[PDB]
Design a protein around this ligand. Structure first.
Ligand SMILES: *Cc1c(COP(=O)(O)O)cnc(C)c1O
Ligand SMILES: *Cc1c(COP(=O)(O)O)cnc(C)c1O
Ligand SMILES: [K+]
Ligand SMILES: [K+]
Lengths: 256, 389, 389, 256
C-alpha cells in the first residue's frame, strides 16, 4: 500500500515519471533472476512488477509464456517465490514491489492467506490478471485488510462505469493498457484514480517520454526486458550490461 | 449481467477485463435470441432438415436379457456429424450471425468440436479458424483433414504442453482482439458465463425429446438417465428437462481412466478440487500448488481437465450423482453393444453405457427403466479399439 | 413363380437346378410377408426406432448460387450404418426369421454390405458368415474389423480373382447346401428373381418419403431425381414411387471410371453387352469371348460388373436415362459439397451429385427442381480422398 | 443325339454300365489334354464329358476351379476349344462327346450359333450348368434343331414335377446327382427319361458297381480324374499311367 505513495511523492518533486520493468521471477534461474533484479534496481528501476510462473498466461502471451517455462524448469516453487521475494525486500527496503498473478494461484491456499504471506514478505500490490472488477470483492477486501494495494487494468475498451470502478477500487497505481489516452487519463484524474502507469508497448525511451508527457505518471516496460534476457541467455554478464544500459536509457527519458 | 453467472458457488466470469464487454454483448444477444420466435424457428428448421432431429430412442432388446432392466438409448450417434456437438454449434453460429459477426474461433483436442465448427461455418458462411494443440494435430489428423476439407483454418498450438488447455487459452487471446468481428464457439458447458447457460439451452432438446418419447413408448418417466461428462454439454442437455422431475435420477459418468487410485484418470468433479481457471470457478485437475494438469481417458473426447459449473452445483445439492468408469469397463461396454445390438458406440458414450450395464448386472432382479445418452458413434474409435484388441 | 421374373427381356432365374426350390421358397415367403400387416408393422418399427427413418430432405442453400436450380439431397447418409444398405438388410433378416432360418450368408467387396448384414444379424439373433475376396479383405480391413466386432464370420475368398464376382459365387455354392437353415442376403437389386423385386420393395421407402417431403416443401414434384448405379438398389429405391409420374425424370449415374474411352470404367448398362451371369440376363462387363471382367471406379462400392434387370429395362423403354461421371468429376463434387454445405458425401453418391452440378453449370438460367439421392456418408472415403489430394 | 443310343444299345447287350470320365479341356496344356483324353478313351472310357473354361464355375467348385485356371493360362480360347473338339472327333468316330457349359458362353454369339458349331464339330450333347428346366426352352429347341441332346441335372431335392420335366426334355442321358436313389431311378424309368448316369462322388470301383446295380445306366467320375492330373502335374508319363489304371479299374467294375 504505502511505498507507492512515497515513490509518487518523491518523483513529483523531481518532475519525473516512474519507470517500472517487468520480469518473471526465477527466469532464467533463481540466482540469475536475483542478479537481474538487482541490476534493474541498480540501473534505475523505480518500482518492480514481478511475474510468478503459472499453467499458462492469458493476459500475456508469447514472450512471457516462454519465460514462465524457463522458470518452471528452474524449480521455482511458490515456496521459492516467497523466499526470493523476502530477500529482494531485505536488500532493497524502499523499492515498491508489485506481483502479477492469476486467480487460481491466489485462491489455492485461501485468498486471505495469500495476502497475509504477501504482507509478511513485503509485497506492496497484487494485480490478478484474470479477476475483472466485477469478480474482485473477495480479492479486494483481502488485500486491503493486509495493506496490499489491489492493482486493476484499465483497458482500451474502457467505458465510464468501468473507469469509475477502477478509480474507486484500485490503489497504488492504475495499470493503463474507442478513447484518446489523453481523455482516459483526464477521466481517471477526475475520478481520482491511483496514478496511471502506461503499460502498453513501452519499448523505446521515446515512448516513456511520450507517456509522462501525456499525463501518465510513468511507464511499465513489459516484454522488452524479457527480450534482452532471451536474446542473451548464455552471455550473462553482457545480458546484465544490456539490461543496465536499457534501464538507464528508459529511466533518463522519464526525466521530463 | 442479465442472467445469474453462478450455479451456487460454481461459475463466474473470471476473465481479463478486456474480454468482459464481449461476454456481456454475447449474453445480451442470447437473451434477445431466446425471446425471438424467428430465431427459434430458424434454429428448429436446421436441426430437423439439416442435422436430423428428432433422433431416435432405441429400446435395447438383447443386452438386458435375463435381468429386469429395460434400457433405451437416445440416439445422438444418428445426428449429422455423428455426435451431439452439432446441436449447439448450429445455435451458436446462428447467434454469431444475429450479432453481425463473420468469423468463428474454436479450439479442439480430438477434432470433433473442430469438425462441428467447420461444418456449421461452411453451411452458414462464416470464416472459421480452429486452435488445436500440436500433440492433438499429430494424433488427430483424420479430423484435421476433415476440418480443412470444410474450409477451416487449423492453427497448431505449441504453447508448452500443446494440448486442449493451451488451445482454449490461445483461442481466448485471439478473441480478445477479434471480438467485434469474430465469435468464439466454445465447445462444452464450461468457461465464463454465459457459455455454461448458452451451451445447455442449445443442447436441452436431447432431454426434451427423451421425455416425450419415453412417455409415448413406456407411459412413464425413466428411473435414471445416464450420460458421460467430459466438460458436460451432452450430460446437461439430457438432464435439463428432467431437473424438476424429482422422481428421475440423473447420473453422470466421468472417466475413471486407469483407475482413480492410479491418478491417471479424468474425473475432477469427484476427485479434483475447486480452482479458478478457464474463466470459471469449478472443480479441476490440479497439483497441490494450483498448476492445472491433463485429464486422462481412453476416449480423447473426455480430456477436458475440469467440468461445467452446473454439474458441480447439481452434485453439491445432491440432485445428480456422478460416478466413474474405467477404460476397461468402457472397452467391454463398446464390444457388448456392437455384438448385441449392432450399434458401434463412441468410446466416450461407452462410459455411460458401462455404468448402466453395472447397475443391471449387480442387481438383476431390480425392475428399472433406464435411458443412456448415446452421444456419438464409434467409427473414429475402431482404430484405437483395434490396437487394444 | 407367383411374380414375373422378367423386366422385359432382362431378369430371369439362371441358376443351377438345385437352388431353384430355395428361390421359390423365398418368393412365396415374400409375397406372404407383403400381405401380412404385422410383418409390415415390425419392419416399419425397426426402420423408425433403430435405423432412423424418415431421413431428411436437405435443400442445398449455397451450392446452387447464381444458377436457377433448386437442389434437395435425400439424406440416406443419416441412416444407421451411414448408407441406405440398412433398409433392405433389416427387411431380409425379418424375412429370414419369418421363414424359420437361423443363419445369413452374404458377400462383399468394400465391406459396407458385410457390415450391414453383420449389424442386422447381431440385432435379430441370426448367425452370419460373410464371403469377401482376399483382395477386398486386404484393402477393406477397417470394415472387416467392424464385421467381426458385430460377431460375423469373415471368410476370405481366394477363387482366382478374389474380388466380389468370386465372392458372389462362393456364397451361392454355400447356399446350395445350406438353404434349409440359412438365408442368402443378397446385396443389390440384381441376381435371380426374386431378389431384384425384393431388394427394390425394401428400398422403395426412400422414394415414397422423397415424394411426400418434396410436396410438403415445394408444393410440386421434382424435375429429376438423380442417383448413382453400382448394381442398382438405392437408385431403384429412389425411382420406384416416381415411375408412374411421367413428369419426373429419373437419371442413373454409372461410374465412368478413368473415362469410358479408356476401358477403365464401371458402366455396363450403357457400355457393356447383355450376358447371362450372377443368375440373371442383364448387361455386363465382358470380353468379346463372354468372360466377365471387373468394374473400375474411384468408389469401391460401385464395382459390381453388371446392373439390375429393372434398370436395363427402364433404359430400353426410355423411361429413365443413364449417364456416367468420371472419377475426377466425383472427386470435385465431393470437395464441393464439403466446402459449401458441410456434408462429406460418400464417393459413390458424389457421382450422382457431380451429374446434378453439371446439369446446373451447363444451363445456369434453366429453372429446375432436382433431388439427388445422397446414399452414404464419406467418412470411409477420407483416407482415399487423402492420397488423391 | 445318336451315339448315346448306340452306346446304350451296345452296353445293354453286354450287361455293363457306362463309365464316363470328366476332364476340363486344355488342362494342363492343349497337347497334354489331348494326350490325356486319348489315354482315357484307350483305357476304356465309354463316353466323354468335357468342361470348357469359364469366369468361374458354380455347379462345380474347388478342383474344377483350379483346373479352369490351368486351362486359361494355357491359352485355350473358344477357337482352340472347337479346334480340339474337331480333332478328338477325327481320331475317335464313335465315342459320345458331351460338353459341360455355362449359359453366358452359349449365349455369347447366339444360342443357335453355338449349337450349329457343336453340330459341325461332332458334339453329341450339351449340359448348360446354370439353365434350370424353367429357363431352358431357347437352349432346348436350338439343341434339338441341331441334333444335340440337351442334358439336364436331376438333383437330390428333385420333386415329381421336376422329374416329369427332366424326362420330357432331356435326351442322351439324365445326369443324376429327400428320395432314395432306387426311387428316383424308378420314377425316371416310369416317366421314360433318358438313361440315368450317376454323377455324385463316383471315385472308387466299388461305387461304379453300386450305381449300375442300383439301376443307373452308368457313372460319371468328375473330379477324381482331375485329382490324378493335379497330383502328377510334372510327372506326365506316370500321370497318364495312373489315369490308365484308374479308368481300367473303374471300367472293369461296371461289368456287373
Ligand atoms: C463432445 C463429445 C463428448 C464429451 O463432451 P461433453 O461436452 O461432456 O458432452 C462425449 N461424447 C461424444 C460422442 C462427443 O462427441
Ligand atoms: C451400397 C452403396 C451404393 C452402391 O450400390 P447400389 O446397390 O447401386 O445402391 C452406393 N452408395 C453408397 C453410399 C452405398 O453404401
Ligand atoms: K472432465
Ligand atoms: K455396375
Amino acid at each position: 500500500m504505502e511505498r507507492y505513495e512515497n515513490l509518487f511523492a518523491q518523483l513529483n518533486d523531481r518532475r519525473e515519471g516512474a519507470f517500472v520493468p517487468f520480469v518473471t521471477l526465477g527466469d532464467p534461474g533463481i540466482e540469475q533472476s536475483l542478479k537481474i533484479i538487482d541490476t534493474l534496481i541498480d540501473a534505475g528501476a523505480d518500482a518492480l512488477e514481478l511475474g510468478v510462473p503459472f499453467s499458462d498466461p492469458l493476459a500475456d502471451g508469447p514472450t512471457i509464456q516462454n519465460a514462465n517455462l524457463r522458470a518452471f524448469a528452474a524449480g521455482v516453487t511458490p515456496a521459492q517465490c516467497f523466499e526470493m521475494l523476502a530477500l529482494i525486500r531485505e536488500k532493497h527496503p524502499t523499492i515498491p514491489i508489485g506481483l502479477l498473478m492469476y486467480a487460481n494461484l491466489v485462491f489455492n491456499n485461501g485468498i486471505d492467506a495469500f495476502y497475509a504471506r504477501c504482507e509478511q514478505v513485503g509485497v506492496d500490490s497484487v494485480l490478478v490478471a484474470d479477476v475483472p472488477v466485477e469478480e474482485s470483492a473477495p480479492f479486494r477486501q483481502a488485500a486491503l485488510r493486509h495493506n496490499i494495494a489491489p492493482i486493476f487494468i484499465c483497458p482500451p475498451n474502457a467505458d465510464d462505469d468501468l473507469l469509475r470502478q477502477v478509480a474507486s477500487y484500485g490503489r497504488g497505481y492504475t495499470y493503463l493498457l474507442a478513447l484518446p489516452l489523453h481523455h482516459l487519463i483526464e477521466k481517471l484524474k477526475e475520478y481520482h484514480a491511483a496514478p496511471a502507469l502506461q503499460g502498453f508497448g513501452i519499448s523505446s525511451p521515446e515512448q516513456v517520454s511520450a507517456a509522462v508527457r501525456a499525463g501518465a505518471a510513468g511507464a511499465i516496460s513489459g516484454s522488452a526486458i524479457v527480450k534482452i534476457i532471451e536474446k542473451n541467455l548464455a552471455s550473462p554478464k553482457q545480458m546484465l550490461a544490456e539490461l543496465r544500459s536499457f534501464v538507464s536509457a528508459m529511466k533518463a527519458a522519464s526525466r521530463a | 449481467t442479465l442472467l445469474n453467472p453462478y450455479f451456487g458457488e460454481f461459475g463466474g466470469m473470471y476473465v481479463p477485463q478486456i474480454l468482459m464487454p464481449a461476454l456481456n454483448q454475447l449474453e445480451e444477444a442470447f437473451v434477445r435470441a431466446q425471446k425471438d420466435p424467428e430465431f427459434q424457428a430458424q434454429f428448429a428448421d436446421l436441426l430437423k432438415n439439416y442435422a436430423g432431429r428428432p433422433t431416435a430412442l432405441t429400446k435395447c432388446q438383447n443386452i438386458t436379457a435375463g435381468t429386469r432392466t429395460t434400457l433405451y438409448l437416445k440416439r445422438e450417434d444418428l445426428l449429422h456429424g455423428g455426435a451431439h456437438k452439432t446441436n449447439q454449434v448450429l445455435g451458436q453460429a446462428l447467434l454469431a450471425k444475429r450479432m453481425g459477426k463473420s468469423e468463428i474461433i474454436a479450439e479442439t483436442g480430438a477434432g470433433q468440436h473442430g469438425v462441428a465448427s467447420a461444418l456449421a461455418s461452411a453451411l452458414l458462411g462464416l470464416k472459421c479458424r480452429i486452435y488445436m494443440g500440436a500433440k492433438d494435430v499429430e494424433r488427430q489428423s483424420p479430423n484435421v483433414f476433415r476440418m480443412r476439407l470444410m474450409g477451416a483454418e487449423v492453427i497448431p498450438v505449441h504453447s508448452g504442453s500443446a494440448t486442449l488447455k493451451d488451445a482454449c487459452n490461445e483461442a481466448l487471446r485471439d478473441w480478445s482482439g477479434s471480438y467485434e468481428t469474430a465469435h468464439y464457439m466454445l465447445g462444452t458447458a464450461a468457461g465464463p458465463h454465459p457459455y455454461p447457460t448458452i451451451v445447455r439451452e442449445f443442447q436441452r432438446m436431447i432431454g426434451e425429446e427423451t421425455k416425450a418419447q419415453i412417455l409415448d413408448k413406456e407411459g412413464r418417466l425413466p428411473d435414471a438417465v445416464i450420460a458421460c461428462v467430459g466438460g458436460g454439454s451432452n450430460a446437461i442437455g439430457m438432464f435439463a428437462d428432467f431437473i424438476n422431475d424429482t422422481s428421475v435420477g440423473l447420473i453422470g459418468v466421468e472417466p475413471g481412466g486407469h483407475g482413480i487410485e492410479t491418478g491417471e484418470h479424468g474425473a475432477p468433479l469427484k476427485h479434483g478440487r475447486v480452482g479458478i481457471y478457464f474463466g470459471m470457478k469449478a472443480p479441476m485437475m490440479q497439483t497441490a500448488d494450483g498448476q492445472i494438469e491433463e485429464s486422462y481417458s481412453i476416449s480423447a473426447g473426455l480430456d477436458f481437465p475440469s467440468v461445467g459449473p452446473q454439474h458441480a452445483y447439481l452434485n453439491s445439492i445432491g440432485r445428480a450423482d456422478y460416478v466413474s468408469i474405467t477404460d476397461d469397463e468402457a472397452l467391454e461396454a463398446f464390444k457388448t453393444l456392437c455384438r448385441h445390438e449392432g450399434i458401434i458406440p463412441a468410446l466416450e458414450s461407452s462410459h455411460a453405457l458401462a455404468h448402466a450395464l453395472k447397475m443391471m448386472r449387480e442387481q438383476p432382479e431390480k425392475e428399472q427403466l433406464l435411458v443412456v445418452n448415446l452421444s456419438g458413434r464409434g467409427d473414429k474409435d475402431i482404430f484405437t479399439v483395434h490396437d487394444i484388441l
